[PDB]
Ligand binder design. Structure first.
Ligand code: HEC
Ligand code: HEC
Ligand code: HEC
Ligand code: HEC
Ligand code: HEC
Length: 437
């Protein structure tokens, strides 16, 4: 029936897909969760402690991460900390399109606890249901997220009515597996949510266009980065954007579902494409599953390598802004022209580190683009470092060859008890990166 949210009702017509839907050390890598940066990820990517201080750090919640059930306990805490209101429910309850239509601006301004109170108790933890992807009348794919994806498709110049079944096989995932921004009012309350797809087209939602959008919208300054004092925006899991940007598998005609919901019927388990002896891959690939596993590992190791290069280069710039501010506080003049150019280049580097870092395929969704973006992040950061090293030297402050990041000073009081960055550790990259923890 129309308006039936209960997956158990849909499960009486389609028991197989209902059965898979409710179902939920590794040699593969993962990036960071943009909305839940953990102490574990800071330990893995040490530059993140300095770059993300001011965004919020938390404990790794090692619980099942499937669509069917989503507990609200940690989402309540995070929401109330950020004053995000109902925003964090947008991609995590089939009631989100209904709540936003009925509450309007109040869905974003009303505290999380009061928005969650409106959802029936029997479905408080229902995450992503059949109604979010399927039309109940004919089981064809649909866009339940009109207020987010529907609006973002208009920005791309896409006629939603002319979308093919193949396009919907990725766009149904693009309802949530994309980057978003939260516009805020003067009282730091959330006043909306949008995908920064202005200026982009289908098959080309580039980091250049996303960054240009973020930097042009003063309302999406969601936090203050502590090391620099700069008000910045943020990027979260840009999976559809990275994948669809002319990637190898996008050009090959693969959709998200070819790897994540492969046929046998379409697998409704959100299981890893690397499991079951690479069965999702073997549908196109003639190579041994071990060869395919080794290729994913080589892509992920290459991406991690570039994440550390670009991340340590970006952290070096942020640390030099901190030295430049401390010099200004002492009455030393820092050359305005050098400083402004360095800040402009620094933001270009920072958003690129977050863009690839927050995408959890660790380069696999678009290996060539992951390389281009992280290579550009290093070029932007190294040029900002050039101008800040010069500005500091002009002001009488000599920056050594190895920059002391003092990573421990960016650990919250809770994090100091869980993690320590050895001050004697020195990163000396073959390309020029030279930092000490
Ligand atoms: C919003 C309503 C979503 C739609 C539509 C799709 N996904 Fe999703 N997915 C969403 C969330 C909020 C989460 C996290 C759940 C949690 O436990 O907090 C997920 C998770 C996945 C995963 C697992 C990732 C992980 O952290 O291990 C995968 C592999 C995944 N989703 C794939 C996926 C695909 C292929 C989709 C389209 C058919 C799709 N999702 C749609 C939210 C939403
Ligand atoms: C849609 C555009 C989303 C909004 C708005 C928010 N989240 Fe999210 N989240 C989304 C997806 C598709 C995924 C899984 C994919 C991936 O690569 O991780 C997630 C994941 C999380 C997680 C990690 C899973 C877990 O440990 O349970 C957390 C903790 C989480 N999301 C929190 C969170 C908060 C606090 C938000 C509000 C600011 C928020 N998310 C918004 C998609 C979307
Ligand atoms: C989005 C993230 C989905 C959720 C949640 C559910 N389903 Fe699904 N389903 C999805 C896709 C992308 C596809 C492939 C469509 C295509 O173009 O072939 C499917 C397919 C089905 C089908 C028909 C084909 C098949 O595999 O048998 C049925 C009958 C079906 N799905 C049922 C179903 C039910 C009952 C769900 C909730 C409990 C459910 N789906 C959730 C994407 C998504
Ligand atoms: C095959 C060629 C793929 C296509 C097309 C897409 N994805 Fe993928 N993804 C793939 C692999 C091999 C991996 C590596 C890690 C693994 O979980 O096995 C991933 C990873 C993800 C994740 C992260 C999972 C986690 O545990 O956090 C998500 C959420 C995800 N992929 C989503 C996703 C979406 C929405 C896609 C379309 C835009 C998409 N993937 C395409 C393989 C392939
Ligand atoms: C078909 C629909 C595919 C699925 C599903 C998967 N892959 Fe794929 N892949 C596909 C094509 C057409 C190509 C282009 C190869 C060519 O002839 O140029 C690829 C390529 C890759 C590569 C790169 C190989 C290289 O020469 O460097 C890798 C490493 C790869 N694919 C891995 C892979 C994995 C692990 C998959 C499952 C999760 C997977 N692919 C699925 C088509 C399709």
């Amino acid at each position: 029936p129309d308006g039936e949210v209960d997956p158990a009702v849909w499960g009486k017509a389609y028991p197989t897909e209902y059965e898979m839907w409710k179902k939920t050390k590794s040699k593969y890598k993962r990036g960071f969760d943009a909305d839940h940066v953990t102490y574990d990820k800071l330990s893995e990517f040490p530059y993140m402690a300095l770059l993300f201080n001011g965004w919020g750090f938390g404990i790794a919640y090692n619980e099942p991460r499937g669509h069917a059930n989503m507990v609200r306990d940690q989402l309540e805490i995070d929401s109330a900390r950020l004053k995000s209101g109902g925003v964090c429910l947008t991609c995590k309850t089939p009631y989100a399109p209904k709540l936003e239509k009925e509450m309007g601006i109040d869905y974003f301004k009303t505290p999380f606890k009061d928005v969650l109170a409106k959802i029936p108790e029997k479905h408080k933890t229902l995450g992503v249901a059949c109604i979010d992807c399927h039309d109940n009348k004919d089981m064809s794919l649909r866009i339940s997220r009109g207020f987010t994806l529907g609006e973002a498709l208009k920005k791309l110049g896409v006629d939603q009515a002319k979308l093919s079944r193949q396009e919907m096989r990725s766009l149904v995932c693009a309802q949530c597996h994309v980057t978003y921004n939260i516009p805020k009012d003067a009282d730091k309350k959330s006043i909306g949510v949008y995908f920064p797809w202005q200026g982009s087209k289908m098959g080309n939602i580039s980091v250049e266009n996303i960054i240009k959008q973020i930097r042009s919208d003063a309302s999406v300054g969601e936090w203050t980065q502590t090391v620099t004092g700069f008000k910045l925006g943020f990027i979260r899991h840009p999976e559809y954007e990275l994948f669809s940007n002319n990637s190898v598998h996008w050009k090959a005609g693969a959709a998200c579902t070819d790897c994540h919901m492969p046929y046998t019927v379409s697998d409704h388990r959100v299981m890893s494409p690397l499991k079951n002896d690479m069965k999702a891959c073997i549908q196109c690939h003639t190579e041994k599953p071990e060869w395919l596993r080794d290729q994913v590992i080589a892509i992920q190791d290459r991406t991690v390598s570039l994440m550390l290069r670009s991340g340590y280069a970006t952290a070096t710039v942020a640390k030099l802004f901190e030295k430049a501010h401390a010099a200004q506080a002492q009455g030393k003049q820092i050359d305005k022209a050098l400083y402004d150019r360095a800040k402009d280049l620094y933001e270009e580097a920072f958003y690129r580190c977050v863009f690839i870092g927050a995408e959890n395929s660790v380069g696999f969704h678009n290996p060539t683009e992951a390389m281009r973006v992280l290579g550009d992040a290093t070029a932007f950061a190294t040029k900002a470092e050039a101008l800040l090293r010069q500005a500091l030297a002009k002001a009488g402050v000599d920056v050594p060859l190895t920059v002391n990041l003092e990573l421990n000073k960016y650990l919250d009081q809770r994090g100091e008890k869980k993690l320590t960055f050895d001050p004697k550790v020195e990163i000396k990259d073959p390309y020029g990166v030279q930092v000490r923890f």
